UniProtKB/Swiss-Prot annotation, chain C:
Job description of the protein: Precursor of the fusion protein processed in the biosynthesis of the S protein and the formation of virus particle. Mediates fusion of the virion and cellular membranes by functioning as a class I viral fusion protein. Contains two viral fusion peptides that are unmasked after cleavage. The S2/S2' cleavage occurs during virus entry at the cell membrane by host TMPRSS2 or during endocytosis by host CSTL.
Name the record gives this protein: Spike protein S2
Species annotation: Severe acute respiratory syndrome coronavirus 2
Domain of life where this protein originates: Viruses
């Protein structure tokens, strides 16, 4: 039988009390949702660890036998409704018992631990029981306040589970995340060597009609030739075949510069003598091999081929020699030897003797006296390139499938494919720009084959949001869909889990190459829509004039500052260790430069803050009675009960957003930053453009606007004629901003990004402390404890890595400060050209025609509320460039001619205010004939 | 393609980057400054220009009175742009 | 192509993640850069037939 | 380690000898003799200007 | 093997650091093209040059 | 390395043969 383990088999990994933290441990655990045999007591395997469990009501199971025996004893060492779960790893016995496999999470407390000291591979239960097998996995574990592992995530079970581990959270927001990388794995292994045999002439020495006699033992040099030694080995009937130098099977792959094959015919008794360091008549006077001799000696009987019935007398041996012969030396001399005085000449006598007495060979002679021709291969290495190098058999080339390929010495893994390149005859490999092998010619068939990289790429997971769904879609970037193992193909890559839809919408999770994704109950992909088409009614004589408008408050958040941090490099790099500090001083310059760069960043943060807020000279104050024409600034002006003068919108913004490492406080307190904002607001309300350009003069607020209307081309009459409508449109717009920023978008995303980026950088800095950098251990104390001179070098390794960690941090902060200086520089320009005056720059201070703007202090930046005039309620009319009266063109001083079908009128450009045409609004410049589009009217 | 180095594709395709330019180019020809500050409102193109002369200190009489000459000098100037680029500086 | 090299590499740890996050931010900005220059239009306007 | 030992409000589970905060720095030790959690906090360090 | 990794990790860090500096130059030009699109294409600038 | 075609022209020499002599040569002569 088989059962599914649901999130079961988790244990407390160690004895550390970790509180309210998600910690990722790489250890052996039961893969979530795995197979569990069910039960009955057969002996079972213990491959690594076993999550044995025993649902029971009568305590029928009473022990586990492992080979150790547990029944209450744990001998090998002796010691002191049911759901008894017991992880075993070798022999820790984590265990838990729960009254109720059930679907629940129960981490196993390490209740029992034992120093057994033995290896276990098998086990049995002494008597329902379910057995599962532990496998190495990475798990993110969630500890509660009490230090208990409430929940866990396996990072290989699913695409979402890998994403959750990458973000180190059990909750994932909607988006595309690069979880990991995809690699096609080689199918097989191909080895190839040249077809040409280059056969050595062993054939003409091992077998030939005649062989050399022992006194003139023949020597043949064999070189520049492949040889198959195993061709000699397969028959295996050799009286000898002893290989003194090296193993017989080993011979084929070895390379030696020259092999010297010396062949002679010797009787059977003396075949043993031809061995390294052997002493006898035929191994002393004639051929002799040294103690260091390297080679294989082969021998075989030859009574038929060599011996003859008459008596073969044509092999002859050297029985008397005056001086012993050095190794591998041959003497062919017939010089009479003669141990003794009386000068014997070249004519033999009483002690003078032919030094070459005769072998007598006949067929009837017993084994050991019959001729046994022998070869003495002597493979040798010289400094020059070796030639005698036997080739491997080779394997048929596999084409179009990723394979591990070795050709003539070139080792690579790739997909072999047909190539149209024509290599010159000498050329073998081909190499692309960037020095990578990109082509090869097969040694056996001499044909050009391309080498192409095996498919590889990035795996990105498209998630609708853990809150919305657990469904996910995967994009394999830069992979044809054919090679990945509904499925769609895009220039971005192959997308699985999302079905393409022809209908187009706005983008949600950008996928790439023009295609976006979203969550409908399912996940749909499409071509993003740039927007809705709108042909304008372009025409020779037709105009559109706006008859009504809107007052729009819009919000822009610009960061103005970042956290001022200070690092004690001695405490970070060393930390409570006297010896490390001395070694750090050897470089010396790095610590001061790191401190100086960080001080410069911090002083800039104060200048960045005071170039935006300190634009006013005196602290302006608002009047006791706040009646400003009906405009309600209660939402923007200071409220005294609130956490300072913090206004109600400022109050919402504020709510909505170690060891070596410090934070220095901002010089300007949040209360002063609020007082600067209050003065900037107080002057703008009761002065206008005036406070910035000199002494702060005073005009009533209905009269400050009407002069901000004049800037945008709108006559004063509009605000005075329509004052209360504009005041309510303004009050409602200010009212919605509290609600819209209240939670509708990630409004304060830009300011929260700065807090997030800085925190992640300090966390990388603290985690980098853990990295060994190749020394024995990260902890300085342990390196010092384990080693005596030896320790100093290992400490130096940590200092270099930690200094590079600090150097990377300061370099990144200098790049981050440049962006905050640019944001602070624009925030300062928006204060001057918007709060202190009205901009004519297009879309600089609001989208629309700027009327005014208000500064609000957010935590590390400023939010500006930009009041703008948006035209609305358009009507279409007929326009003629000049109205001809009395033969004179009459263009208008300011105004556009327009017609309601019959009557002709001059109108302000951005508001439809028709006026009759008279000389005061009309200027006459020319004659009627030259102008094209002129109309006839009375002025 | 390489030893781990990939070039991820741009989200906005060259055709999409070229319909943005076309809308930017037709809102300007048909309406004028208007399409950036609210609903796009039509005006004849000789008229949008008369307003752009009025906005640099010259007056409206100058464009209507020199419309063909300004239009031809404008057309000839646009022609040299391609030729200078094609000739190549 | 070396499992032996891969095992040694994990000791540094944060170096690979920091590089990928930095390169990922450059990539997202390149897209924001082209949507601030060219997505200044709410609707796709079209020129008239004549 | 070098540090200041103080009374702890943390409730270590019975088998848990040490405690670590985020950044894996030992923050608490259950004293062996009385089996009670004694926190560890580093002595004062700061910049002098 | 470690010596090759240290060199290769440094080479990737130099590339990433240089791309962040280059990204900032493009961000400034993208920001000027965004200002030029708004004040030249979407309105007539009175700014000089 | 050798090629068969002093002219002002460029002709690279392909590798005719490589010999595993293994011995130093410091002098040249022609026949
Ligand atoms: C000679 O030796 C070669 C190599 O072992 C063998 O293949 C061949 O059959 C032999 N020929 C004769 C004539 O013995």
């Amino acid at each position: 039988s088989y059962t599914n383990s649901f999130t079961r088999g988790v244990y407390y990994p160690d004895k550390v009390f970790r509180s309210s933290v998600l910690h990722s441990t790489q250890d052996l655990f039961l893969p979530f949702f795995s197979n569990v045999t069910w039960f009955d007591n057969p002996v079972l395997p213990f491959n690594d660890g076993v999550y044995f469990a025993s649902t029971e009501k009568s305590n029928i199971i009473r022990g586990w036998i492992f080979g150790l025996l547990i029944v209450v004893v744990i001998k090998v060492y002796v010691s002191q409704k049911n759901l008894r779960e017991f992880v075993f790893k070798n022999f820790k016995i984590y265990s838990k018992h729960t009254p109720i496999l059930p679907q629940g999470f129960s981490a196993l407390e390490p209740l029992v631990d034992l120093p057994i000291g033995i290896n276990i591979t098998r086990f049995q239960t002494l008597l329902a029981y379910y057995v599962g097998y532990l496998q190495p996995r990475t798990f993110l574990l969630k500890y509660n306040e009490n230090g208990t592992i409430t929940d866990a995530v396996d990072c290989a079970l699913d695409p979402l589970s890998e994403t959750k581990c990458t973000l180190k959270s059990f909750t994932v927001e909607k988006g595309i995340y690069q979880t990991s990388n995809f690699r096609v794995q080689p199918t097989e292994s191909i080895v190839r060597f040249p077809n040409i045999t280059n056969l050595c002439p062993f054939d003409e020495v091992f077998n030939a009609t005649r062989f050399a006699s022992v006194y003139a033992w023949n020597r043949k040099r064999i070189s520049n030739c492949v040889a198959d030694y195993s061709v000699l080995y397969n028959f295996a009937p050799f009286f000898a075949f002893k290989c003194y130098g090296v193993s017989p099977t080993k011979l084929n792959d070895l390379c030696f510069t020259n092999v010297y094959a010396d062949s002679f015919v010797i009787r059977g008794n003396e075949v043993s003598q031809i061995a390294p360091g052997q002493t006898g008549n035929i191994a002393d006077y004639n051929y002799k091999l040294p103690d260091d001799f390297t080679g294989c000696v082969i021998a075989w009987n030859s009574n038929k081929l060599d011996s003859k019935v008459g008596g073969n007398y044509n092999y002859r041996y050297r029985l008397f020699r005056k001086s012993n012969l050095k190794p591998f030396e041959r003497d062919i001399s017939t010089e009479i030897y003669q141990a003794g005085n009386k000068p014997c000449n070249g004519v033999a006598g009483v002690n003078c003797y032919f030094p070459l007495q005769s072998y007598g060979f006949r067929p009837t002679y017993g084994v050991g006296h019959q001729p046994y021709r022998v070869v003495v291969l002597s493979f040798e290495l010289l400094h020059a390139p070796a030639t005698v190098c036997g080739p491997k058999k080779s394997t048929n080339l596999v084409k179009n499938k990723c394979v591990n390929f070795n050709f003539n010495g070139l080792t690579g893994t790739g997909v072999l494919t047909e190539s149209n390149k024509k290599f010159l005859p000498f050329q073998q490999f081909g190499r692309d720009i960037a020095d990578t092998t990109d082509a090869v010619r097969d040694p056996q068939t001499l044909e050009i084959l391309d080498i192409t990289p095996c498919s590889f790429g990035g795996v990105s997971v498209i998630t609708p949001g853990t809150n919305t769904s657990n469904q996910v879609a995967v994009l394999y970037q830069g992979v044809n869909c054919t090679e990945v193992p509904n499925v769609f193909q895009t220039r971005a890559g192959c997308l699985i889990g999302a079905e393409y839809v022809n209908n187009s919408y706005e983008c949600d999770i950008p996928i790439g190459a023009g295609i976006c994704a979203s969550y409908q109950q399912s996940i749909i992909a499409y071509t993003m829509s740039l927007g809705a088409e709108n042909s304008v009614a372009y025409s020779n004589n037709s105009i559109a004039i706006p008859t009504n408008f809107t007052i729009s408050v819009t919000t822009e958040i610009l960061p103005v500052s970042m956290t001022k941090t200070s690092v004690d490099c001695t405490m970070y790099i060393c930390g409570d260790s006297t010896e490390c500090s001395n070694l750090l001083l050897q470089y010396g310059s790095f610590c001061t430069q790191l401190k100086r760069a960080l001080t410069g960043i911090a002083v800039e943060q104060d200048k960045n803050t005071q170039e935006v807020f300190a634009q006013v000279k005196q602290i302006y104050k608002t009047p006791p009675i706040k009646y400003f024409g009906g405009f309600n600034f209660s939402q923007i002006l200071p409220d005294p009960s609130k956490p300072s003068k913090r206004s109600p919108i400022e109050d919402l913004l504020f709510n909505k957003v170690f060891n070596g490492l410090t934070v220095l406080p901002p010089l300007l307190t949040d209360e002063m930053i609020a007082q600067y904002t209050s003065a900037l607001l107080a002057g703008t309300i009761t002065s206008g453009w005036t406070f910035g350009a000199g002494p702060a003069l005073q005009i009533p607020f209905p009269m400050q606007m009407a002069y901000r209307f004049n800037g945008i081309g709108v006559t004063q009459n509009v605000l005075y004629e329509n004052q209360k409508l504009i005041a309510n449109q303004f009050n409602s717009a200010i009212g919605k901003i509290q609600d819209s920023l209240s939670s509708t978008p990630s409004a304060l995303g830009k300011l929260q990004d700065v807090v997030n980026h800085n925190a992640q950088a300090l966390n990388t800095l603290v985690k980098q402390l853990s990295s060994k950098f190749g020394a024995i251990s990260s902890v300085l104390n342990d390196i010092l404890s384990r080693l005596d001179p030896e320790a100093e070098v290992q400490i130096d390794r940590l200092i270099t890595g930690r200094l590079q960690s600090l150097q990377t941090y300061v370099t990144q902060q200098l790049i981050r400060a440049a962006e905050i200086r640019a944001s602070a520089n624009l925030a300062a320009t928006k204060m001057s050209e918007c709060v202190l005056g009205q901009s004519k720059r297009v879309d600089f201070c609001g989208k629309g025609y700027h009327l005014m703007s208000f500064p609000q202090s957010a935590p590390h930046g400023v939010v500006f509320l930009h009041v703008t005039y948006v035209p609305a309620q358009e009507k279409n009319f007929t326009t003629a460039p000049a109205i001809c009266h009395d033969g004179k063109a009459h263009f208008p001083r300011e105004g556009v001619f327009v017609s309601n079908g019959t009557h002709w009128f001059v109108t302000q450009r951005n508001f439809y205010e028709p006026q009759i045409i008279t000389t005061d609004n009309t200027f006459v410049s020319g004659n009627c004939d030259v102008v094209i589009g002129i109309v006839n009217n009375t002025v | 393609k390489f030893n781990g180095l990939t070039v991820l594709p741009p989200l906005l395709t060259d055709e999409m980057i070229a319909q943005y330019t076309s809308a930017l180019l037709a809102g300007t020809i048909t309406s004028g400054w208007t399409f950036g500050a609210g609903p796009a409102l039509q005006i004849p193109f000789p008229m949008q220009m008369a307003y752009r002369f009025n906005g640099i200190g010259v007056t409206q009489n100058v464009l209507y009175e020199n419309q063909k000459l300004i239009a031809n000098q404008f057309n000839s100037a646009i022609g040299k742009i391609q030729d200078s680029l094609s000739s190549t500086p």
